[PDB]
Amino acid sequence: AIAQLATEYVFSDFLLKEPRLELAVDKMVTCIAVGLPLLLISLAFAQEISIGTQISCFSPSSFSWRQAAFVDSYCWAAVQQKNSLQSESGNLPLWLHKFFPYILLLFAILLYLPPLFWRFAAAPHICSDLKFIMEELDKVYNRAIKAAKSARDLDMFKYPIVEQYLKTKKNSNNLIIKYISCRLLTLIIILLACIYLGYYFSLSSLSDEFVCSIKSGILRNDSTVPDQFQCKLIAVGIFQLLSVINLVVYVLLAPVVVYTLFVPFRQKTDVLKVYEILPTFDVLHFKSEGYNDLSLYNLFLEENISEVKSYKCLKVLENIKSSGQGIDPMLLLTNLGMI
Amino acid sequence: RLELAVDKMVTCIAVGLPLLLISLAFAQEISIGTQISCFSPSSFSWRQAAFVDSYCWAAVQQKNSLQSESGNLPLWLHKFFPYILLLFAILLYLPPLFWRFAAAPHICSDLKFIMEELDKVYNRAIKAAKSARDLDMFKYPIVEQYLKTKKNSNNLIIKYISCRLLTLIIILLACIYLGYYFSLSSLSDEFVCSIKSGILRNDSTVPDQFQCKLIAVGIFQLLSVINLVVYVLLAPVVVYTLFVPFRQKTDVLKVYEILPTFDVLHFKSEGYNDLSLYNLFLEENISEVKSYKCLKVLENIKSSGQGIDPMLLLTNLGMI
Amino acid sequence: AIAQLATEYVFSDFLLKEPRLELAVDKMVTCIAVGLPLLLISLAFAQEISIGTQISCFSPSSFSWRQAAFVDSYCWAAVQQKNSLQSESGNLPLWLHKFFPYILLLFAILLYLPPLFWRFAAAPHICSDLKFIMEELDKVYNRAIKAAKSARDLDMFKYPIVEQYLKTKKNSNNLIIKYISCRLLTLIIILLACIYLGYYFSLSSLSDEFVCSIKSGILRNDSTVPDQFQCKLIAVGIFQLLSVINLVVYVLLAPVVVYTLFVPFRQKTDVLKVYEILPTFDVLHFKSEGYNDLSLYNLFLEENISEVKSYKCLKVLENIKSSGQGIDPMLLLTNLGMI
Amino acid sequence: AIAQLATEYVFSDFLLKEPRLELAVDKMVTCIAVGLPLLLISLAFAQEISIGTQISCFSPSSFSWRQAAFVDSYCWAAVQQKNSLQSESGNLPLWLHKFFPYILLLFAILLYLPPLFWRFAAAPHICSDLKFIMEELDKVYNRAIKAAKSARDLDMFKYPIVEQYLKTKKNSNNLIIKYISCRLLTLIIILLACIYLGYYFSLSSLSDEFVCSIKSGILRNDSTVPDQFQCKLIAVGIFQLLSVINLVVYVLLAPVVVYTLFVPFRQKTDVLKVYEILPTFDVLHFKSEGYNDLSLYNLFLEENISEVKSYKCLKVLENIKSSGQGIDPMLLLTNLGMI
Amino acid sequence: RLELAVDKMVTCIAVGLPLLLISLAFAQEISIGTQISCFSPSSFSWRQAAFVDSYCWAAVQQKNSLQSESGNLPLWLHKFFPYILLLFAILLYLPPLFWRFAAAPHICSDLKFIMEELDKVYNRAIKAAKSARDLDMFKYPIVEQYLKTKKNSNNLIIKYISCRLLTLIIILLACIYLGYYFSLSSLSDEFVCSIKSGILRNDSTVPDQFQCKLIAVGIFQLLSVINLVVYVLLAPVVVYTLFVPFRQKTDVLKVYEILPTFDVLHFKSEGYNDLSLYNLFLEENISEVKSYKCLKVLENIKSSGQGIDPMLLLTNLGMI
Ligand SMILES: C[C@@H]1CC[C@@]2(OC1)O[C@@H]1[C@H](O)[C@@H]3[C@H]4CC[C@@H]5C[C@@H](O[C@@H]6O[C@@H](CO)[C@H](O[C@H]7O[C@H](CO)[C@H](O)[C@H](O[C@@H]8OC[C@H](O)[C@@H](O)[C@H]8O)[C@@H]7O[C@H]7O[C@H](CO)[C@H](O)[C@@H](O[C@H]8O[C@H](CO)[C@H](O)[C@H](O)[C@@H]8O)[C@@H]7O)[C@H](O)[C@@H]6O)[C@@H](O)C[C@@]5(C)[C@@H]4CC[C@@]3(C)[C@@H]1[C@@H]2C
Ligand SMILES: C[C@@H]1CC[C@@]2(OC1)O[C@@H]1[C@H](O)[C@@H]3[C@H]4CC[C@@H]5C[C@@H](O[C@@H]6O[C@@H](CO)[C@H](O[C@H]7O[C@H](CO)[C@H](O)[C@H](O[C@@H]8OC[C@H](O)[C@@H](O)[C@H]8O)[C@@H]7O[C@H]7O[C@H](CO)[C@H](O)[C@@H](O[C@H]8O[C@H](CO)[C@H](O)[C@H](O)[C@@H]8O)[C@@H]7O)[C@H](O)[C@@H]6O)[C@@H](O)C[C@@]5(C)[C@@H]4CC[C@@]3(C)[C@@H]1[C@@H]2C
Ligand SMILES: CCCCCCCCCCCCCCCCCC(=O)OC[C@H](COP(=O)([O-])OCC[N+](C)(C)C)OC(=O)CCCCCCCCCCCCCCCCC
Ligand SMILES: CCCCCCCCCCCCCCCCCC(=O)OC[C@H](COP(=O)([O-])OCC[N+](C)(C)C)OC(=O)CCCCCCCCCCCCCCCCC
Ligand SMILES: *[C@@H]1O[C@H](CO)[C@@H](O)[C@H](O)[C@H]1NC(C)=O
Ligand SMILES: *[C@@H]1O[C@H](CO)[C@@H](O)[C@H](O)[C@H]1NC(C)=O
Ligand SMILES: *[C@@H]1O[C@H](CO)[C@@H](O)[C@H](O)[C@H]1NC(C)=O
Ligand SMILES: *[C@@H]1O[C@H](CO)[C@@H](O)[C@H](O)[C@H]1NC(C)=O
């Protein structure tokens, strides 16, 4: 039903993302934490199709079919007010048993929200900046070959705009603010889900029973109707299993979110160390140890560098130089076709 | 374009939440649900009891007494809750539809024309700068007057403020109705239904009062409170986005002012004019324009303190 | 069932229109008046999912299940002939309670007929004429620049076909006849629906009851079967509410159609007053105050002008002259790029 | 429900892959191991549509319909706590019977995870690498013709970038690490599924019966209700058959995964032995017998080389040479058209 | 390409008919169908009788006696028949899938290269022929020796024979299974089911034997006989196709032999070699090649007996 039509929208929307603007680690986290609950609740609905009825009260044999159906329906709607159990104290919170499959829909919506906001808050700027930086690198590589080859012809500097742009971006702290707020919101929602599921699993172990009275308005002085109907909820075990599965999954997943929160630590490889090879590129080690957009930009560039055609060939040059062969760079540079 | 970062979110939430809620209500009714259930005596057979339930289901509209309150109470709201929400969804979606049919074409055309004019002016600047250099070795801002004229018109602002006012009014009506329903749907889900209407008035077998009880009142109450809290949280966003001029936090044209061919005009419209709405739209849509990006970096390079002449940097920018 | 099918066809056929040949106001009317009844029929059909059965008769306890089902269904099909109510005179029309959902489908069909016919009788001709007029205005604008620029070069008239075409169209009254007949049919259908819904609301307030007799063919001489079954229609209240909602909506909507009917009045802003600016365009105030196709053409143009490119740059020029700057039009005209 | 949805999803994601980045053997394994359980559980749900109810308890004749329904429901949800069987010891794990169609979905999700991780962690780099290698091979092939043709004209060396690229990729152990971890995870999941299904088949042969007591909360002092109901799970046989089928399929499939795990042994054919032929290509036998990315790259190129045009034409040249005809390679080289 | 005229029909019929038939078996149950139905005494209420039916439905797997035969009989086949056919369909469709994943790309590449080479050698002949006339007024056979070397290998043949053998073996298994089922599903659709298993052994009211009876055995019998006859008729087709060299009835390359630039080599492979399979594929795919159509006409013109020189007719053909 709602879970059935909720998973189509989220999964179909997800497939649009596949064909930059994301991360290798975060995307898995948001996929799992929003797909597992949806599948589990749709599955609970499948079980309800196979065999399932939330409540079932035991009415005496004198009652006909309709009277017993009325008893079941009444005790189904009287859960919200209060009802005593003959194994515990006065009352207990029982309506969690009614609304559990919808709390999971709420949690899925809340978990999906932060990624949507990020897509509506940081994708345009980041894609534009990455495209401009990659175009600048492609240009500056091309100028090197032109300058490189022109030197050979005689034998036989444009301002680093991208460098200044990155230097300026190093000062700002807006994109990092948004990308850290999104992760903090996701972690907080996951923690709330963890505590809620733990509490439910603790509760949904002893109090699925009932004692429901039907003498509300005019039957108070009736004689045929009995006092107490020992009703019992039926879909508590499935809910308990789903809750424990989700709790363990979120417990395992939370440390991943905690780790990925650390933007500066995640930078393990320096891509620009290779593009430093180009003579036209000034030697600047862009290892931003602080919380700056450059660090996030560096992490994004780590993923997106494979797209640019200059990286791989330039990398080959460093290996050739480091292999121990006394070959001048210009002979190797002219040995590289124009991109 | 033709929308906003904030307004689209508001029209999404305020029309999607009620739909999802009545959706899951119908899902609950699939799982287990029957609106009404009356307690008929044991003598009644199956069909007589079914008729009692049916009759008490339809006699709600006229009136029915409760043995805990005064004479009567409005109960048919319990029947009609899953249609009032559809009405609210329709009424909330109407304003954005009217906007799509009354302000999308004009805004699209004006934005495209403006963008083309800025791009042309940018190219003209390079030609003048490049031509000036060559010797060493003005086309009237149609766009400027276009925005100056639009500063005088007060039409699109009227439409875009009427739309927001209608949406806010409908949201407040929804809030108050849902609050009233939540207040009501706390004590009066019970019944006392009499079935001796037309000819059974003089029968003896049928009893007098059947203690019927609506069953889907708790779920409706929970959905009502959820909608009420969501709309209460959402309303201040609509009230804020109503104020157009205040939203103009950043002056994007301050960058295109850099171009020598562009006259230095601060288009900071503090009043309610079509320009201010236009400034809001250009702030969003400027990223589509290529000239903005390269011009902005020039200012940062110039603001870096380096004594590089703009002509030397201008010729270092390829033709877009 | 049928309504679910119907709303799919209309709204889908509507989405084709969204991507000239319409009007800002008329379209809202033909959308609302055909979307509300469909949605309410769908709501009733969904109500019949939660809880609903049109009729329910009260048969005595001696009757078994099948006999009571027969009684219910017989009284369901005996509505069409006549039946007495034990609060009124002889009879009353009760088959309106059966076919009410059919009537709303009929009204939706009849309300969507006018725009469908309009799309086959006035869309092609209007599109052709507007495209021709826009192309002619674009050409005459370009000719003006060429005449202006050539005049400047020296310092250092083609027939107005479109004007004659519009003058000729001013004399004809065909498109006006069609676009007024469409609105008149829509208004007449709305009025018929209003009166019908008002009569139904007046009716469906006192006579949802019944007195059914089942002694038709051979039971007339029987003994076990009783005489009168106090049957009662069930979905009368939902239909009453839907009728009142539709009545109030159509009462509010009718004045909009009344207003839009007055074609000459709707012409508020003279768009061609701006193309009057061009030196090549002859000064003709096309303020048609009579019922002529030109007025309809003017209305259809006023919306579509944003499509043209000459209007905007030309509107720019006029208000500089108003601004008070003594700049010659030729200098500004040469300062205008070719479109 | 979930199985119908899940099979549509998983298969739908599968179809996109069909139109490199996979293997002939691995793809079949990840198809079968995730398609069989889905189909089996979907057919189990269809079987339940035809005839099926998980549980059915035998209540005495005095009980009415609703009391018997409550007994059935109660005994359906009392499986989780504990229940005795009058053929065995005190208790036995019975809730596996309830959850067998849950565990198969869990196994399907776990099995399909590693392929998704591989696509999200080892698709793009390999794609770029193969593109670069094939482009370099095409260029060097073109260079060979130019040198050969130019030599004839007189009668009448660009640096090995790609070869050093492979020499450098020989020393890295990253993509091999990922591709071995994915296979190991899949094998571990398959083994866990095998052992679980074996244990279930062992269990689901003797303990589908029940002895269910109803006197839980207030009926403990009742007299009409009897003590024990001989309930019996109904869908145990179908689950047993599905379990044995899945167990045998996975037992047969596991050795395939174990065999394919060995990357170096799968390098049966030395495909670069053909590109050794070109005069411009250095004679380097890249028969990596260790666990190095080159081995994985060699395996992928053994599949993707058919995309390269130069292989086909070049392979024919050697076979012409091996036929025994004394034809100069230059005469045959000029007999080959430019690609 | 990547298929055959006869094989595709086989793999379509043999995997479509069982699917349609079991689709029909499921559909019939919508109209009327319930696999089992036992006869419980009148004293039993509704729920007790339902339990009897269910218990006898699941006790089929262990064993049950029939009062017309010996101790027991395999009865669970009646339960699983609409699943065994799904298994058979999966197995039948497996080999074509593997073949698509193991031989389609190689055949595609090789055929494409061969047709391109043939088109080239067709054009080159006309250029040589055209140049001869102008005066009046040899590129190495890559494709020929390519086919010569392919004649030596036996890989694509091994795959295309293993796939056919697997399909035939599965067909034979299905035939024998369906024959056995039809033999069985003619006398033993009845039951004698006892319900005194766990605690009712000492009970009194419950009777000893319930004469249950499976209901969906006749329809299964009809479906089984239909599938058996269809597969019996189909098997000889697969057997005939299994002989690769015999299928090469026509020598399509006999026409390309016409071109003077093409050396005369009769590629009539009488052995199990990739060339024979390649010849079979090329016979189907030759219509895609344009050189064949014109060339075949020239020989027909030549065979007409008219003394028209081939060069005069060769120049009468435009470039493709
Ligand atoms: C139940 C309670 C009470 C009642 C209620 O409340 C609850 O529920 C009611 C009910 O529920 C109502 C809804 C019922 C369903 C209705 C459907 C909807 O229209 C349909 O909406 C989609 C179906 O749901 C399809 O539209 C697109 O849906 C997908 C969008 O991604 C497809 O993927 C595809 O997209 C388009 O095509 C594919 C491209 O990749 C896309 O980028 C896009 O362009 C489809 O649209 C396409 O469908 C076909 C397949 O392609 C056409 O061929 C194609 O046209 C093409 O034409 C040219 C080529 O031939 C052109 O070049 C271009 O390629 C076009 O794509 C057409 O676009 C379909 O089609 C059509 O629009 C509209 O009636 C409103 C609607 C929602 C209703 C709104 C109001 C309600 C809710 C009611 C109400 C409130
Ligand atoms: C009852 C018994 C027992 C049970 C069982 O047995 C029986 O029945 C079960 C059930 O029944 C199962 C089936 C359910 C249905 C399933 C559907 C199937 O996926 C779908 O398969 C096709 C519909 O059936 C479509 O895929 C292509 O189908 C045709 C292929 O020729 C189209 O022509 C087009 O082809 C592609 O596009 C057109 C080009 O000309 C082609 O060369 C090709 O590329 C379609 O695919 C395309 O469909 C749309 C139209 O173009 C998309 O837009 C497009 O994606 C595009 O997206 C972008 C543009 O929008 C992008 O830029 C680019 O253009 C992309 O191409 C997508 O490629 C569709 O789409 C989708 O794949 C796959 O899940 C397996 C499937 C059969 C299942 C197999 C297993 C079962 C049987 C089960 C089982 C055993
Ligand atoms: C009862 C059980 C099932 C209940 C399912 C309930 C689902 C109802 C969904 C209705 C659509 C709501 C969409 C929210 C957003 C709308 C506005 C918007 O932003 O996008 C509009 C857009 C139109 O274009 P757009 O440009 O506005 O889209 C913008 C989209 N975003 C915001 C994501 C960028 O809508 C669509 O394109 C999609 C329409 C989907 C319609 C789905 C209808 C489902 C109806 C099911 C009703 C239940 C019937 C079954 C009854 C039970 C029987 C047993
Ligand atoms: C019981 C009532 C419902 C009965 C449903 C019966 C439908 C079963 C049909 C299965 C598919 C059969 C297709 C035959 C051809 C297969 C091979 C082929 O050539 O094409 C393959 C192709 C794959 O690509 P392809 O390239 O091989 O396709 C070639 C197609 N032709 C031959 C036309 C050129 O299959 C498809 O793309 C279509 C698959 C259709 C699957 C239909 C699924 C039906 C699901 C319902 C099953 C029953 C469950 C409900 C139970 C009832 C509950 C109340
Ligand atoms: C029961 O009904 C009587 C009238 O018949 C009423 O006076 C009395 O208050 C009722 N008893 C209780 C305990 O409510
Ligand atoms: C009931 O019926 C009797 C006669 O059968 C009549 O006198 C009396 O008025 C009826 N009761 C009412 C309230 O009309
Ligand atoms: C009444 O029934 C009897 C038989 O039951 C029949 O003979 C008679 O004709 C019936 N009355 C009339 C007026 O026909
Ligand atoms: C039944 O109830 C009485 C009190 O009502 C109690 O004393 C007795 O112990 C109960 N019997 C059993 C077997 O629990």
Ligand SMILES: *[C@@H]1O[C@H](CO)[C@@H](O)[C@H](O)[C@H]1NC(C)=O
């Ligand atoms: C009667 O029941 C008892 C246990 O209640 C059991 O020991 C005995 O075997 C039963 N009698 C028969 C004949 O099975």
